Amino acid sequence: PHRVTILADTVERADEIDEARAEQARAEAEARRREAQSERDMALAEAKLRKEMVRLRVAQL
């Protein structure tokens, strides 16, 4: 009687229309996944690789 809750699976606002051009989707394309994930994975994998190579290189102590 006092509140309404919508446990919806997916909620979209096509009314915005520019949402794509908007960062919501435009950044989601570049500001997200591209650097939010792909760049994260590249950097972290490169760090692990440099670590493993130098830990082989230090295998004489």
Question: Would you tell me which residues interact with another protein (CB under 8 A)?
Answer: 55, 58-59, 61
Q: Which residue has the tokens 């096509």?
A: 14
Which is nearer to another protein, 14 or 58 (by Cβ)? 58
CA-to-CA distance for 61 and 7, rounded, in angstroms? Answer: 59
Q: How far is the CB of 56 from another protein (least distance, A)?
A: 10
Contact by Cβ (8 Å): 13, 19: yes
Q: How far is the CB of 58 from another protein (least distance, A)?
A: 6
CA-to-CA distance for 60 and 45, rounded, in angstroms? Answer: 25
Which is nearer to another protein, 35 or 52 (by Cβ)? 52
